[PDB]
Scaffold this active site. Structure first.
Site, PDB file in Angstrom:
ATOM      1  N   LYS A  16       8.282   4.146   1.772  1.00 38.23           N
ATOM      2  CA  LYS A  16       7.511   3.106   0.975  1.00 38.23           C
ATOM      3  C   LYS A  16       6.705   3.725  -0.156  1.00 38.23           C
ATOM      4  O   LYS A  16       6.524   3.390  -1.211  1.00 38.23           O
ATOM      5  CB  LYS A  16       6.998   2.073   1.569  1.00 38.23           C
ATOM      6  CG  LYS A  16       7.497   1.020   2.525  1.00 38.23           C
ATOM      7  CD  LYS A  16       6.650   0.063   3.248  1.00 38.23           C
ATOM      8  CE  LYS A  16       7.395  -0.964   4.006  1.00 38.23           C
ATOM      9  NZ  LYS A  16       8.366  -0.378   5.043  1.00 38.23           N
ATOM     10  N   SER A  67       8.787   3.792   7.434  1.00 34.55           N
ATOM     11  CA  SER A  67       7.941   3.409   6.278  1.00 34.55           C
ATOM     12  C   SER A  67       7.279   4.356   5.125  1.00 34.55           C
ATOM     13  O   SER A  67       6.730   3.944   4.362  1.00 34.55           O
ATOM     14  CB  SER A  67       7.013   2.170   6.703  1.00 34.55           C
ATOM     15  OG  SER A  67       7.684   1.311   7.585  1.00 34.55           O
ATOM     16  N   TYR A 104       2.161  -7.359   5.556  1.00 31.47           N
ATOM     17  CA  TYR A 104       3.158  -6.274   5.450  1.00 31.47           C
ATOM     18  C   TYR A 104       4.592  -6.677   5.655  1.00 31.47           C
ATOM     19  O   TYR A 104       4.961  -7.324   6.418  1.00 31.47           O
ATOM     20  CB  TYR A 104       2.764  -5.169   6.565  1.00 31.47           C
ATOM     21  CG  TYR A 104       3.258  -4.018   6.460  1.00 31.47           C
ATOM     22  CD1 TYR A 104       3.327  -3.206   5.494  1.00 31.47           C
ATOM     23  CD2 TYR A 104       4.264  -3.359   7.551  1.00 31.47           C
ATOM     24  CE1 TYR A 104       3.776  -1.775   5.470  1.00 31.47           C
ATOM     25  CE2 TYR A 104       4.604  -2.384   7.679  1.00 31.47           C
ATOM     26  CZ  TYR A 104       4.681  -1.358   6.602  1.00 31.47           C
ATOM     27  OH  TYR A 104       5.251  -0.260   6.479  1.00 31.47           O
ATOM     28  N   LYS A 145       0.278   7.447   5.369  1.00 31.64           N
ATOM     29  CA  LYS A 145       1.303   6.455   5.531  1.00 31.64           C
ATOM     30  C   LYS A 145       1.901   6.753   7.033  1.00 31.64           C
ATOM     31  O   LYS A 145       2.325   7.703   7.372  1.00 31.64           O
ATOM     32  CB  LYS A 145       2.082   6.187   4.500  1.00 31.64           C
ATOM     33  CG  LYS A 145       3.140   5.243   4.590  1.00 31.64           C
ATOM     34  CD  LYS A 145       2.371   3.957   4.284  1.00 31.64           C
ATOM     35  CE  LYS A 145       3.354   2.723   4.865  1.00 31.64           C
ATOM     36  NZ  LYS A 145       3.385   2.631   6.420  1.00 31.64           N
TER      37      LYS A 145
END
Ligand SMILES: [Cl-]
Length: 355
Positions: free
Chosen positions: A66, A63, A149, A303
């Site tokens: 992202k 992720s 999410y 992140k």
């Protein structure tokens, strides 16, 4: 020299014990501080071949992809090709007539369209079933009311941002944004020439947008440096700013485009809470900021990213010009990533231990 000694000790005190406790085969750690990159490599990229981890080993980022998607959306914004307040169906005619006439790009990017789930249902196997799924989706919450999410959510955002640029997402990313960033060892598809440095993991509709990037510790540290000290191109500077801005708060956590931020200095408990499964897997009330804030006060941006066999984490603090990269070929708990990174950050930044 005292700071470098502290950094060395913090890595030695955190990373080997973590790898032993969680049976992690290999880790690449990279720290940027005082204008210098520091690389700490442990273990093997493959248990089968014994190939050592180096700062050039490629890992799946999950992720953290992202954050790249958020910068791509920021770039389309910077070029006047989209507006975050626009309705999603403006960018894909096949979505016209659905609920995406009433959901904004900002809501998609920030997982707040109204309850899009963590993953696509299995009924979604390609483009046509993907469009049929979105066309038939019925929200659980009004737009903007809850953060949940969601890969379908930010995935659609990245898909529409690419459409606004006139390109398939993979092309806009691999053949547009990554070359502009100067990242030559960051990939959606690892080329044949780099397969020998591609780590093995140990335990795909819109997968590129949501979890498909692979990178090395060296390239990802360069990425963090670019996020803190932007290159000259003004569209890229505005794209980075847009991805870092705070659009709403969930407690202490400040939601950007992919990036998640915190006012800094921050306690370990609050950073753990903001990176918890509770915040990821349950719908959250938010407080929208009007206008979005590119903070003057100090902020920490981070992140987590995971795949079936990989576990990654990045954080950076622009005011301090410090970035931390931790790439592993096992998907181990996010809380342990945060704890280790916080101990390393505390050794580089005295304002943190002082709390
Ligand atoms: Cl690949």
């Amino acid at each position: 020299d005292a700071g470098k000694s502290d950094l060395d000790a913090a890595v030695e005190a955190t990373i080997p014990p973590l790898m032993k406790a969680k049976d992690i085969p290999g880790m690449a750690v990279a720290v940027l501080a005082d204008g210098k990159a520091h690389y700490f490599n442990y273990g093997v990229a493959s248990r089968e071949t014994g190939q050592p981890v180096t700062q050039d080993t490629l890992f799946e980022l999950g992720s953290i992809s992202k954050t790249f998607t958020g910068i791509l959306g920021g770039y389309a914004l910077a070029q006047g090709k989209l507006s975050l307040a626009d309705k999603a169906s403006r960018y894909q005619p096949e979505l016209k007539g659905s609920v995406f006439d009433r959901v904004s790009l900002l809501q998609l990017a920030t997982y707040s369209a109204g309850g899009l789930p963590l993953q696509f249902p299995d009924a979604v196997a390609g483009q046509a079933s993907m469009l049929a799924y979105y066309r038939g989706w019925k929200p659980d919450y009004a737009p903007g009311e809850r953060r949940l999410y969601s890969n379908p959510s930010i995935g659609l955002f990245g898909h529409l941002a690419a459409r606004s640029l006139g390109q398939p997402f993979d092309q806009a990313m691999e053949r547009g944004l990554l070359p502009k960033l100067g990242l030559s060892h960051t990939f959606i598809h690892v080329p044949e020439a780099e397969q020998s440095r591609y780590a093995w993991g140990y335990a795909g509709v819109l997968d590129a947008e949501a979890y498909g990037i692979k990178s090395s510790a060296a390239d990802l540290l360069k990425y963090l440096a670019i996020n803190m000290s932007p290159p000259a191109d003004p569209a890229l500077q505005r794209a980075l700013d847009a991805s870092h801005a705070a659009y709403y708060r969930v407690g202490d956590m400040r939601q950007g485009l992919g990036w998640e931020g915190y006012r800094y200095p921050i306690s370990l408990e609050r950073l753990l809470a903001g990176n918890s499964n509770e915040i990821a897997f349950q719908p959250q009330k938010v407080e929208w900021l009007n206008p979005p804030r590119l903070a003057e006060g100090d902020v920490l941006l981070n992140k987590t990213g995971s795949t079936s066999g990989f576990g990654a984490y990045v954080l950076f603090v622009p005011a301090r010009k410090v970035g931390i990269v931790m790439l592993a070929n096992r998907n181990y708990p996010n809380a342990e990533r945060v704890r280790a990174a916080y101990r390393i950050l505390s050794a580089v930044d005295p304002s943190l231990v002082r709390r």
